[PDB]
Amino acid sequence: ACVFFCEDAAIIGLAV
Amino acid sequence: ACVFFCEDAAIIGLAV
Amino acid sequence: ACVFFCEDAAIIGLAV
Ligand SMILES: [Cl-]
Ligand SMILES: [Cl-]
Ligand SMILES: [Cl-]
């Protein structure tokens, strides 16, 4: 899989 | 939630 | 549509 990143600021990865 | 970003170029945020 | 990017490292685009 691979990691997408979002801005919460903190950077959060999300595995997909 | 948090904001993911895509390239349209313009940068577009998407709230999730 | 627009391209989101993930980290695999390689950078991978995903069209949405
Ligand atoms: Cl995750
Ligand atoms: Cl949004
Ligand atoms: Cl694609």
PDB file of N, CA and C and ligand atoms in Angstrom:
ATOM      1  N   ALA A   1       0.853  -1.209   0.000  1.00  0.00           N
ATOM      2  CA  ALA A   1       0.000   0.000   0.000  1.00  0.00           C
ATOM      3  C   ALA A   1       0.887   1.258   0.000  1.00  0.00           C
ATOM      4  N   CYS A   2       0.256   2.462   0.194  1.00  0.00           N
ATOM      5  CA  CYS A   2       1.022   3.704   0.197  1.00  0.00           C
ATOM      6  C   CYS A   2       0.345   4.717   1.111  1.00  0.00           C
ATOM      7  N   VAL A   3       1.111   5.712   1.527  1.00  0.00           N
ATOM      8  CA  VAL A   3       0.669   6.623   2.556  1.00  0.00           C
ATOM      9  C   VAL A   3       0.270   7.975   1.949  1.00  0.00           C
ATOM     10  N   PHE A   4      -0.977   8.367   2.139  1.00  0.00           N
ATOM     11  CA  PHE A   4      -1.426   9.700   1.768  1.00  0.00           C
ATOM     12  C   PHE A   4      -1.286  10.560   3.007  1.00  0.00           C
ATOM     13  N   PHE A   5      -1.184  11.863   2.816  1.00  0.00           N
ATOM     14  CA  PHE A   5      -0.943  12.799   3.910  1.00  0.00           C
ATOM     15  C   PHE A   5      -1.973  13.895   3.940  1.00  0.00           C
ATOM     16  N   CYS A   6      -2.462  14.205   5.139  1.00  0.00           N
ATOM     17  CA  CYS A   6      -3.353  15.337   5.308  1.00  0.00           C
ATOM     18  C   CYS A   6      -2.842  16.305   6.368  1.00  0.00           C
ATOM     19  N   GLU A   7      -3.351  17.531   6.265  1.00  0.00           N
ATOM     20  CA  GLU A   7      -3.047  18.605   7.183  1.00  0.00           C
ATOM     21  C   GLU A   7      -4.145  18.687   8.226  1.00  0.00           C
ATOM     22  N   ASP A   8      -3.768  18.565   9.498  1.00  0.00           N
ATOM     23  CA  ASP A   8      -4.701  18.744  10.606  1.00  0.00           C
ATOM     24  C   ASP A   8      -4.257  19.969  11.397  1.00  0.00           C
ATOM     25  N   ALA A   9      -0.459  23.435  12.149  1.00  0.00           N
ATOM     26  CA  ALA A   9      -1.134  22.156  11.941  1.00  0.00           C
ATOM     27  C   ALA A   9      -0.138  20.994  11.888  1.00  0.00           C
ATOM     28  N   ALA A  10      -0.683  19.766  12.123  1.00  0.00           N
ATOM     29  CA  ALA A  10       0.097  18.540  12.096  1.00  0.00           C
ATOM     30  C   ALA A  10      -0.079  17.872  10.742  1.00  0.00           C
ATOM     31  N   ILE A  11       0.897  17.074  10.349  1.00  0.00           N
ATOM     32  CA  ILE A  11       0.775  16.266   9.137  1.00  0.00           C
ATOM     33  C   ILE A  11       0.478  14.835   9.589  1.00  0.00           C
ATOM     34  N   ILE A  12      -0.577  14.267   9.019  1.00  0.00           N
ATOM     35  CA  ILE A  12      -1.066  12.954   9.396  1.00  0.00           C
ATOM     36  C   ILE A  12      -1.000  12.016   8.183  1.00  0.00           C
ATOM     37  N   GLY A  13      -0.413  10.826   8.321  1.00  0.00           N
ATOM     38  CA  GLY A  13      -0.437   9.840   7.243  1.00  0.00           C
ATOM     39  C   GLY A  13      -1.470   8.964   7.364  1.00  0.00           C
ATOM     40  N   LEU A  14      -1.966   8.480   6.223  1.00  0.00           N
ATOM     41  CA  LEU A  14      -3.078   7.523   6.131  1.00  0.00           C
ATOM     42  C   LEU A  14      -2.715   6.415   5.116  1.00  0.00           C
ATOM     43  N   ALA A  15      -2.672   5.156   5.563  1.00  0.00           N
ATOM     44  CA  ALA A  15      -2.350   4.114   4.797  1.00  0.00           C
ATOM     45  C   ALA A  15      -3.340   3.655   3.974  1.00  0.00           C
ATOM     46  N   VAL A  16      -3.164   3.480   2.680  1.00  0.00           N
ATOM     47  CA  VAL A  16      -4.165   2.976   1.770  1.00  0.00           C
ATOM     48  C   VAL A  16      -3.502   1.940   0.899  1.00  0.00           C
TER      49      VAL A  16
ATOM     50  N   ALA B   1     -11.522  16.558  11.481  1.00  0.00           N
ATOM     51  CA  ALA B   1     -11.106  15.946  10.200  1.00  0.00           C
ATOM     52  C   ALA B   1      -9.759  16.545   9.755  1.00  0.00           C
ATOM     53  N   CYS B   2      -9.326  16.227   8.492  1.00  0.00           N
ATOM     54  CA  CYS B   2      -8.055  16.743   7.995  1.00  0.00           C
ATOM     55  C   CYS B   2      -8.129  16.913   6.484  1.00  0.00           C
ATOM     56  N   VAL B   3      -7.232  17.730   5.957  1.00  0.00           N
ATOM     57  CA  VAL B   3      -7.314  18.147   4.577  1.00  0.00           C
ATOM     58  C   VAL B   3      -6.269  17.414   3.725  1.00  0.00           C
ATOM     59  N   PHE B   4      -6.725  16.676   2.728  1.00  0.00           N
ATOM     60  CA  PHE B   4      -5.834  16.077   1.748  1.00  0.00           C
ATOM     61  C   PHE B   4      -5.753  17.052   0.591  1.00  0.00           C
ATOM     62  N   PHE B   5      -4.687  16.966  -0.184  1.00  0.00           N
ATOM     63  CA  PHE B   5      -4.431  17.906  -1.271  1.00  0.00           C
ATOM     64  C   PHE B   5      -4.200  17.194  -2.577  1.00  0.00           C
ATOM     65  N   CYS B   6      -4.813  17.710  -3.640  1.00  0.00           N
ATOM     66  CA  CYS B   6      -4.553  17.194  -4.970  1.00  0.00           C
ATOM     67  C   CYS B   6      -4.118  18.297  -5.929  1.00  0.00           C
ATOM     68  N   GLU B   7      -3.463  17.851  -6.998  1.00  0.00           N
ATOM     69  CA  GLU B   7      -2.991  18.705  -8.064  1.00  0.00           C
ATOM     70  C   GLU B   7      -4.004  18.689  -9.193  1.00  0.00           C
ATOM     71  N   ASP B   8      -4.511  19.866  -9.554  1.00  0.00           N
ATOM     72  CA  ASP B   8      -5.401  20.009 -10.702  1.00  0.00           C
ATOM     73  C   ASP B   8      -4.689  20.868 -11.741  1.00  0.00           C
ATOM     74  N   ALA B   9      -0.646  23.998 -12.664  1.00  0.00           N
ATOM     75  CA  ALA B   9      -1.797  23.399 -11.994  1.00  0.00           C
ATOM     76  C   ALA B   9      -2.080  24.071 -10.647  1.00  0.00           C
ATOM     77  N   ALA B  10      -3.343  23.879 -10.170  1.00  0.00           N
ATOM     78  CA  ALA B  10      -3.796  24.421  -8.900  1.00  0.00           C
ATOM     79  C   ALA B  10      -3.704  23.336  -7.839  1.00  0.00           C
ATOM     80  N   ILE B  11      -3.575  23.745  -6.590  1.00  0.00           N
ATOM     81  CA  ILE B  11      -3.623  22.802  -5.474  1.00  0.00           C
ATOM     82  C   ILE B  11      -5.007  22.941  -4.837  1.00  0.00           C
ATOM     83  N   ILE B  12      -5.677  21.807  -4.680  1.00  0.00           N
ATOM     84  CA  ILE B  12      -7.039  21.757  -4.185  1.00  0.00           C
ATOM     85  C   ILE B  12      -7.082  20.946  -2.883  1.00  0.00           C
ATOM     86  N   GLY B  13      -7.688  21.472  -1.817  1.00  0.00           N
ATOM     87  CA  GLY B  13      -7.877  20.695  -0.593  1.00  0.00           C
ATOM     88  C   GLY B  13      -9.087  20.077  -0.553  1.00  0.00           C
ATOM     89  N   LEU B  14      -9.132  18.919   0.112  1.00  0.00           N
ATOM     90  CA  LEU B  14     -10.337  18.095   0.277  1.00  0.00           C
ATOM     91  C   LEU B  14     -10.442  17.635   1.749  1.00  0.00           C
ATOM     92  N   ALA B  15     -11.528  18.005   2.438  1.00  0.00           N
ATOM     93  CA  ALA B  15     -11.728  17.695   3.717  1.00  0.00           C
ATOM     94  C   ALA B  15     -12.165  16.421   3.958  1.00  0.00           C
ATOM     95  N   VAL B  16     -11.571  15.617   4.817  1.00  0.00           N
ATOM     96  CA  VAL B  16     -12.003  14.275   5.127  1.00  0.00           C
ATOM     97  C   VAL B  16     -11.972  14.127   6.626  1.00  0.00           C
TER      98      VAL B  16
ATOM     99  N   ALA C   1     -10.886  15.927 -13.009  1.00  0.00           N
ATOM    100  CA  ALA C   1     -10.484  15.306 -11.728  1.00  0.00           C
ATOM    101  C   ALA C   1      -9.152  15.915 -11.254  1.00  0.00           C
ATOM    102  N   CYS C   2      -8.542  15.313 -10.181  1.00  0.00           N
ATOM    103  CA  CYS C   2      -7.282  15.834  -9.661  1.00  0.00           C
ATOM    104  C   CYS C   2      -6.468  14.694  -9.063  1.00  0.00           C
ATOM    105  N   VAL C   3      -5.173  14.927  -8.928  1.00  0.00           N
ATOM    106  CA  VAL C   3      -4.252  13.873  -8.573  1.00  0.00           C
ATOM    107  C   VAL C   3      -3.820  14.000  -7.106  1.00  0.00           C
ATOM    108  N   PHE C   4      -4.095  12.977  -6.315  1.00  0.00           N
ATOM    109  CA  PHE C   4      -3.584  12.902  -4.955  1.00  0.00           C
ATOM    110  C   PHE C   4      -2.293  12.113  -5.025  1.00  0.00           C
ATOM    111  N   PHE C   5      -1.430  12.300  -4.043  1.00  0.00           N
ATOM    112  CA  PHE C   5      -0.107  11.683  -4.035  1.00  0.00           C
ATOM    113  C   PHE C   5       0.140  10.917  -2.764  1.00  0.00           C
ATOM    114  N   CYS C   6       0.704   9.719  -2.904  1.00  0.00           N
ATOM    115  CA  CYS C   6       1.118   8.953  -1.745  1.00  0.00           C
ATOM    116  C   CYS C   6       2.586   8.550  -1.826  1.00  0.00           C
ATOM    117  N   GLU C   7       3.125   8.244  -0.649  1.00  0.00           N
ATOM    118  CA  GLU C   7       4.489   7.795  -0.484  1.00  0.00           C
ATOM    119  C   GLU C   7       4.502   6.280  -0.415  1.00  0.00           C
ATOM    120  N   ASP C   8       5.248   5.649  -1.320  1.00  0.00           N
ATOM    121  CA  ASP C   8       5.447   4.204  -1.293  1.00  0.00           C
ATOM    122  C   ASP C   8       6.924   3.940  -1.024  1.00  0.00           C
ATOM    123  N   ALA C   9      11.668   6.043  -0.750  1.00  0.00           N
ATOM    124  CA  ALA C   9      10.326   5.732  -1.238  1.00  0.00           C
ATOM    125  C   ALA C   9      10.004   6.492  -2.528  1.00  0.00           C
ATOM    126  N   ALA C  10       8.987   5.959  -3.264  1.00  0.00           N
ATOM    127  CA  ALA C  10       8.522   6.548  -4.508  1.00  0.00           C
ATOM    128  C   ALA C  10       7.289   7.390  -4.226  1.00  0.00           C
ATOM    129  N   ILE C  11       7.040   8.371  -5.074  1.00  0.00           N
ATOM    130  CA  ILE C  11       5.808   9.153  -4.990  1.00  0.00           C
ATOM    131  C   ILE C  11       4.885   8.645  -6.100  1.00  0.00           C
ATOM    132  N   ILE C  12       3.661   8.310  -5.712  1.00  0.00           N
ATOM    133  CA  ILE C  12       2.684   7.718  -6.607  1.00  0.00           C
ATOM    134  C   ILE C  12       1.459   8.635  -6.705  1.00  0.00           C
ATOM    135  N   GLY C  13       1.002   8.971  -7.913  1.00  0.00           N
ATOM    136  CA  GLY C  13      -0.236   9.730  -8.071  1.00  0.00           C
ATOM    137  C   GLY C  13      -1.317   8.927  -8.260  1.00  0.00           C
ATOM    138  N   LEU C  14      -2.481   9.390  -7.797  1.00  0.00           N
ATOM    139  CA  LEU C  14      -3.765   8.683  -7.900  1.00  0.00           C
ATOM    140  C   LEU C  14      -4.857   9.674  -8.364  1.00  0.00           C
ATOM    141  N   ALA C  15      -5.487   9.407  -9.513  1.00  0.00           N
ATOM    142  CA  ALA C  15      -6.429  10.192 -10.034  1.00  0.00           C
ATOM    143  C   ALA C  15      -7.671  10.079  -9.473  1.00  0.00           C
ATOM    144  N   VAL C  16      -8.350  11.122  -9.037  1.00  0.00           N
ATOM    145  CA  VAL C  16      -9.672  11.064  -8.460  1.00  0.00           C
ATOM    146  C   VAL C  16     -10.487  12.164  -9.089  1.00  0.00           C
TER     147      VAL C  16
HETATM  148 CL    CL D   1      -3.049   4.405   8.558  1.00  0.00          CL
HETATM  149 CL    CL D   2     -13.703  19.905   1.282  1.00  0.00          CL
HETATM  150 CL    CL D   3      -4.704   7.035 -11.367  1.00  0.00          CL
END
